[PDB]
Design a protein around this nucleic acid. Structure first.
Ligand code: ZN
Lengths: 59, 93
RNA sequence: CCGUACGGCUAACCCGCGGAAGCGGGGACAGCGGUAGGUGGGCAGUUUGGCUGGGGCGGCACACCCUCGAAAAGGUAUCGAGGGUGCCCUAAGGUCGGCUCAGGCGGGUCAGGAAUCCGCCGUAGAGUGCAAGGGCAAAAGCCGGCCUGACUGGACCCGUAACAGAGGCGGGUCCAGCCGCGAAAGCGUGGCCUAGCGAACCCCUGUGCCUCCCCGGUGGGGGCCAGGGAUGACAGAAAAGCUACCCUGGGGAUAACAGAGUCGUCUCGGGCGAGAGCCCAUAUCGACCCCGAGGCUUGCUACCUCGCUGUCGGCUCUUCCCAUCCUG
RNA sequence: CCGGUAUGUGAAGCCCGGGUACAACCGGGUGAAGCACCGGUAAACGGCGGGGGUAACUAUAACCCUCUUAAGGUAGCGAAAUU
RNA sequence: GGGUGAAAGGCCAAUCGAGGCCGGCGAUAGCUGGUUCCCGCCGAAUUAUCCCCCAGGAUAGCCCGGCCGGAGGUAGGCAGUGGGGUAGAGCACUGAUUGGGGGUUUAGGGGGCGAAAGCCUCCGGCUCCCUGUCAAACUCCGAACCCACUGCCGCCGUAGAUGGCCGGAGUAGGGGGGCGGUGUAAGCCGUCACCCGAGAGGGGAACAACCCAGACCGGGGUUAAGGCCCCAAAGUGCCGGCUAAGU
RNA sequence: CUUGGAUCACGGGGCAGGGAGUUCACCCGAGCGGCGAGGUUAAGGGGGUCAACCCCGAAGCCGCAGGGAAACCGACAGGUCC
RNA sequence: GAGUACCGUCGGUCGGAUAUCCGGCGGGAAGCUGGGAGGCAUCGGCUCCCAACCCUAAAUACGUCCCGAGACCGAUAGCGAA
RNA sequence: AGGGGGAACGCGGGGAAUUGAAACAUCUUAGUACCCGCAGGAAAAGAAAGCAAAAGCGAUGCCGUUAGUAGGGGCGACCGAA
């Protein structure tokens, strides 16, 4: 037989791959090995639209 | 069809007429030690399509008998003719 | 001793964050390797029979027995005519003795009376384990008595299959052995004759012998003889479909169509005369039976044509027949 | 298709017994998934029953006898691109 | 056997229900086409059994060549010993089939005088006799014909037959004509084995098989089938009669 | 090809050159020739006028005795007739 | 001369058949009073040998090159290519 | 020191289908075609934990026979040593 769309997606071709070079970087907190017991303080300086996220991000 | 349990017949061993009791042969299954079964098992191993013919449920409704006649005087059995086909077989005394 | 189930632990292994030291989380599970079972058109290889007044569905008279067809020796085919078997019987088998059947009539008790009683006539009309045909009367049938030749070892013949080749199957004539019935002569190798089943390879049983790699033991294996287990598509593959997206090689050995043949059917006629027609056979209508023409209606057949052209209807254009609607 | 109980069955392996100076072998038990058994699920695949009789006259029968299944075509549309 | 697909099996360099190039590869087919000089001697077959057999093959039958062996054989006829149930015929078995004249009356529903299935009769059954009809699966009879065998007549054979051994094949789609079964018929299926096939020449207007007749080469004659007004070799031939429809 | 071809059955414009039962291994037969109860060499070796010629080489193969699954057993080199 | 000889099981391969070799998985020795083979396994005799480490000529295969020769072809032949 | 090149011959691994069996699945085609790696003028093998059987032989490789034999195998078609 011939192949299904769900089987062609596993190959990893351009027709199926996400365009993440368009996005703002990943979102992660701060590593424990650098926030062990310090209680860091920060200021919000920008709020931005992110194309890969469904939620707005802040800088 | 009725058949007697006792028959006076020629015995090849005593070389005279004696009394014989009648019995049906009772079968048994294939032995694993036989060369043919060795060969069959040797052909069944590995990556293969099935190697031999396989008729599913091949049987006659009316078969022949296999009877042995055992002598009282001497204790030995023998065959007496060819078998005949009959559905009911009943040993009457 | 070893286990199973559960509970916990961390030090193997796994996950993450980090140059790495480690940290944190899981945890002897998972994952990895080996083996065993199940599910599994997700993916492959194949099969999916034949005869056949084309093919298909139908039907298995796809192996056998009898009568006809069948032409007074033998042989002889069709999806030719009429029917049966794929069993049953320790007796329905072997033998010895004795007896004779169906029906009809006349006698008696009885509703049809099934049947029991008596006499006569009586060539088989009866009966035979089973179809059909054949055969049979001091029996091959009925009634009884004793038995198990429905056996072992072997030989030569006939048929399937004429003439004219055959594996397997079936039948016939005998030689020996051991036995049965019978006073004895004789008969008996299943069923009065002709249907009632089957290769190689493998397996099971019986029986006594031969044999297994230098020799000898034990367990186990191989071989010769006999019986049995099946292939009905019955001289024997283990086996479902679609193609109008279709491909190759071929075929008028074979359908659709024009032609060719034939005319049951069809169309068009006729002979006689049942009679109908106020009465009157035939102005008109003409039953039931019987004899024909045509091949423009449909069918039947398969001679021609499988890459001649395969097309129906309509428009256009020419010509012919009469079996005459109008015009003479 | 999903879930649940195991009572059955269930291969290798393990265990018991026989057999073999050892094996091959033979007979028992245990033995998971699955099969079986109990249930849930149709905007899952799919399915949704005739002969019968009867009214103030000819009619047709709301309705009544009825004959079986898991159930017996509801609202609508209807000689339909379905007759 | 992969891609890509707003899904048409659409498109992937004029190539797609699995691209193109080279290789396996001189793949395989029971199917189609082809196969190269001369003269002489002989000369068939399309039918039985078996095969997933029916456009294919094997075993036999029908042809050829060679050897062995050593005296009988046989396609025809006559007379005999035996066998056979066809044509025809008939009713003696099996089974079909018209009518009358009588006897037993009833196996059985009908009614009648039915005082009740009644003594007794009516439509009907049983056994005769006379009259009339039949048979692929009937026979009291029964040919022509065919078959085996014996003896003779004829033919073949020591210039070696009949027969046996060895070897090489082809043939498994037949047809015309006569016979049979089936079928409205044309046809289908078998059978005989004269012809065509594989057969020139002379005739039927031409014609595979209807008639005469079986063919090395060159010449001379006589006949066959049929024919003789002209086409066209040979008769406007002879005797007796018919036809008026170009029959 | 076909039962059947002048066919409205297939192939067939002209000429010249090319173009289809071969080789090996095994088996069955024959026509001839050599030796003959025996026949024959292979690989190889020696010599020479050096791929031709001459000599050696019986390993093996067939045959001389068969029957039988096997263990095993083991025959008329002529008695009579046509 | 140790994950070796040997046993069991799975896959491949072989003429190797209950008796060929290769690999994977699970087990696993003796070790000089020692060990192995002899076509199913095992017991006893007899015969032959000492694995699990290394090297080694000659006789053999080939000819992109050279040399010689030929019942080979002779320009549509012969290598595709005179 | 290595890397790249070399017709055929050489060593080690991976591994089809057409086809035949008058179908086809074990088998055959075939350890073939093709793929990967590694050497040389030759390579590989090679000095008995062997062959045998009442006698004995004595490392490897090549040629002729053993032999279409033992043996394998829908015990079919075929395959096949020492
Ligand atoms: Zn006894």
């Amino acid at each position: 037989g011939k192949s299904l769309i769900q089987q062609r997606r596993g190959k990893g071709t351009t027709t199926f791959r996400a365009p993440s070079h368009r996005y703002r970087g990943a979102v992660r907190y701060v590593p424990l090995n650098l926030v062990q017991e310090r209680t860091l303080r920060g200021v919000v300086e920008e709020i931005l639209h992110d194309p890969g996220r469904t939620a707005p991000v802040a800088r | 069809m009725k058949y007697p349990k006792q028959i006076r017949t020629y015995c090849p061993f005593c070389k005279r007429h004696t009394i014989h009791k009648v019995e049906k042969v009772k079968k048994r299954p294939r032995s694993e030690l036989s060369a043919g079964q060795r060969r069959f098992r040797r052909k069944l191993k590995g990556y293969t399509g099935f190697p031999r013919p396989n008729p599913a449920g091949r049987e006659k409704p009316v078969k022949k008998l296999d009877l042995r006649f055992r002598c009282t005087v001497c204790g030995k059995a023998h065959t007496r003719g060819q078998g005949f086909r009959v559905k009911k077989f009943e040993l009457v005394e």
